[PDB]
Amino acid sequence: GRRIQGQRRGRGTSTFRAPSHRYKADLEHRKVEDGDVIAGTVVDIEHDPARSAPVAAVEFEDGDRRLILAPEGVGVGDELQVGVSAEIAPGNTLPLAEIPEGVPVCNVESSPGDGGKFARASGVNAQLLTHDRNVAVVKLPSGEMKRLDPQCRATIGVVAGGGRTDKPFVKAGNKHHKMKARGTKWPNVRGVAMNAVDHPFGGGGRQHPGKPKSISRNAPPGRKVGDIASKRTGRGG
Template identity: 40%
Template structure:
């Protein structure tokens, strides 16, 4: 997708770039307001999730993760920015008059056509069950439970790979490196999610991060002993413990927090890599 570079007028625009085809669309029936509890506080006003708060107001875009319009061709009308995710979204006009938002597949352009169904071609942006996909297909927006809609590989630049089929299950390699089993009846979208350079974006200044609703983070070693187990001492002293700890004394930085007897444990063939 063509890039438009900013002229360096301020520090916040230095090394900045935007995609020239991406734009903000006027409000339609798929865009509406929602109540956000983004301050990280409970009903008593106590902070329960740190480093959250502030941020700009956002309107929610209803995304079609299920791709329910079966065997009906749709045309990409716009490629838009979505403030609720780091991936771009596409507005699709279907042949029956329906309008839906989907995640923008990498390489898709305005005017391209897509379709979802069972017997559809293996083409970027098309959605179909894993049963009808050949091995080695790059996919995203993958269902875990049939009919619930895509739940895996939805962030910008993510892509999974279909590596094996056996019985009623398909083996996928996820973006995290995890290898797991999923029913072949579950559907997925062909291709990679667009905006692959999202993780390399330069925010430019601290205020840009505040607009995203992210509060500043302070090192535990810079706090007092009453506030953090790493606190105390003069200057950058060691933490004084064998292993790093959270503010509440639990192990941190590398300690696995996944439940041992989780329902999906039998579906995971190989855990994700660090």
């Protein structure tokens, strides 16, 4: 047959890429030799095209102007701080070690210094639970307990724009416009509606998958479609 859609994707052509040339800023934590003496003032609040959520512009003491993954409640004028001694308020970024347990955190680092990886979507937030001289236990937004180095820096508060998913798109046109700002091919045609040549589910006189939808993890790309390595399906039982 022909490569299925998932295979055209990898090639990274236009249709499948994100309009990076239209993105504002690779939101990443600042760096500080140490001390923590760093702090800047919120200058503006902008819309981040890449995440359909607001981001805050900031000017630091050393005259450094950069956009920041904004938590909720951060307004212009506000003064944020980034360092080991940074105050324990919303908006400030500091190593989990200095953050008190039970505090909602966002934009957490996987490895200290990576500048943030976890919890960065609209309104999500991690949860610092356990402290240790060795491990800091964070409960990610997926509900998973993540064991992190207490040296991994993170921002206090929950990500801004929460509740964005509550309103339906209502019409194709609204998806269209949003989709156009992401690295995604849209709309979606179901395999079952295609020709056998184009997808493992294609063909037939009527529309239905030609085999059970649950595919093996070891399946080769081109054949791995439907329910990937499903531990189970359905809602019952």
